[PDB]
């Protein structure tokens, strides 16, 4: 996260680190949606162009964390993956359309002051909250700038951007399964996700019921925090038929 600040303790209790076993390194962010299910970006797990194709036994999920590198004994909990489920129409070839995947943990994780699930939006929350100008919050342990790394979990609040402006920022084709977010140049505040933040949550706090909803998944951008560019997020609500479908069947 570029131009963010340190998270408060327990600020983002749904944050998950996807951690590679060998070499031991940060793979991506992710989020906890129940005691056994974790949400992330498909391209955290599968992306042929960069020869990424992670199997269950390659990775671990670290929940309850604040410090990036330390083992937070008797705070964090580390979970093994039972199974990965990638959206069957995830378009890695062109534009990261439907950049979404689920991971079922081997055992349920115990909730705690530091570990707690985020809500998924329903159609009404989406329609209420996913509006140009409305801010969400993006958290992660990714780079502090494009071209270094945080001691602790970083947070930034960013406005959702009008769809034409998102389109006009890029040569990539933007689908209804994505929204972008970020300050414009003339807004003179900044902030963005960056490398290692992919997979992590874009959350909003509903003013109607005072709960947090994951509206987005950190997906992609062209550089980090550049003037005139924005971050692109998976639209969680548009893909919730699939989420429900996976969770109901498995």
């Amino acid at each position: 996260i570029v131009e963010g600040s340190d998270a408060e303790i327990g600020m983002s209790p749904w944050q998950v680190m996807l951690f590679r076993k060998s070499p031991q390194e940060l793979l991506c962010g992710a989020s906890l949606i129940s005691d056994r299910w974790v949400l992330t970006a498909a391209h955290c797990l599968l992306y042929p162009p960069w020869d990424k194709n992670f199997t269950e036994n390659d990775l671990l999920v670290r929940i309850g964390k604040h410090s990036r590198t330390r083992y937070e004994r008797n705070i964090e909990k580390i979970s093994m993956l039972e199974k990965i489920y990638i959206h069957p129409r995830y378009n890695w070839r062109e534009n990261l359309d439907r950049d979404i995947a689920l991971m079922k943990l081997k055992k349920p994780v115990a909730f705690s002051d530091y570990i707690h699930p985020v809500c998924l939006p329903d159609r009404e929350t989406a329609a209420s909250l996913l509006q140009a100008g409305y801010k969400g919050r993006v958290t992660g342990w990714g780079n502090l700038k494009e071209t270094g790394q945080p001691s602790v979990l970083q947070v930034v609040n960013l406005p959702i951007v009008e769809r034409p402006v998102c389109k006009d920022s890029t040569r990539i084709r933007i689908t209804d399964n994505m929204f972008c977010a970020g300050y414009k140049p003339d807004e003179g505040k900044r902030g963005d996700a960056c490398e290692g933040d992919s997979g992590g949550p874009f959350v909003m706090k509903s003013p109607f019921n005072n709960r947090w909803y994951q509206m987005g998944i950190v997906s992609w951008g062209e550089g980090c925090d550049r003037d005139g560019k924005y971050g692109f997020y998976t639209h969680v609500f548009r893909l919730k038929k699939w989420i429900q479908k996976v969770i109901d069947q498995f």
Partner: peptide, 27 residues
């Protein structure tokens, strides 16, 4: 039933330092 209510914030009625920025953008 408990989703999105943080044990250290909503659960104890404490606000984090920037959640008001979000609220203020919601209209």
């Amino acid at each position: 039933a408990d989703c999105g209510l943080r044990p250290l914030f909503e659960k104890k009625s404490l606000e984090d330092k920037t959640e008001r920025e979000l609220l203020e953008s919601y209209i």
